[PDB]
């Protein structure tokens, strides 16, 4: 047991990512959340991680 807690919110976004690059993101976020001090990777954490690694997507209006 050396993995963080992953929520359906974060995984729902990760499920939109091809299986061969899922590990690239998931492992990176695992290290990211630990770095910031978050045991549970949520949608917010994944969001911050994504922006940190490369948040080039533009969808600021979700509502």
Explain what the structure shows.
With 63 residues, this protein is mainly alpha-helical. It contains three helices and two strands; from the N terminus they run E-H-H-E-H. It has a two-stranded parallel ribbon. The longest helix is centred in the middle third of the chain and has 18 residues. The chain is globular and about 35 Å long. The relative contact order is 0.19. Belongs to the ChlB/BchB/BchZ family. It comes from Chlorobaculum tepidum (strain ATCC 49652 / DSM 12025 / NBRC 103806 / TLS) (Chlorobium tepidum).
Key structural traits:
63 residues; mainly alpha; Helicase, Ruva Protein, domain 3; 3 helices; two-stranded parallel sheet; Light-independent protochlorophyllide reductase subunit B; globular; oxidoreductase
Tell me the domain tally. 1
- Percent of residues in helices comes to 55-70%
According to CATH, what is the class?
A: Mainly Alpha
Principal-axis shape: globular
The third-level CATH topology is: Helicase, Ruva Protein, domain 3
Question: Total number of β-strand segments?
Answer: 2
Classified in CATH, the superfamily is Proto-chlorophyllide reductase 57 kD subunit B
Give the ordered list of helices and strands: EHHEH
**CATH architectural group:** Orthogonal Bundle
Number of helices: 3
Q: Structural class, from helix and strand content?
A: mainly alpha
Largest sheet: 2 strands, parallel
The radius of gyration is 11 Å
Span between termini: 37 Å
- Strand residue percentage: 5-15%
Subunit structure: Protochlorophyllide reductase is composed of three subunits; BchL, BchN and BchB. Forms a heterotetramer of two BchB and two BchN subunits.
Organism: Chlorobaculum tepidum (strain ATCC 49652 / DSM 12025 / NBRC 103806 / TLS) (Chlorobium tepidum)
Protein name: Light-independent protochlorophyllide reductase subunit B
Family: Belongs to the ChlB/BchB/BchZ family.
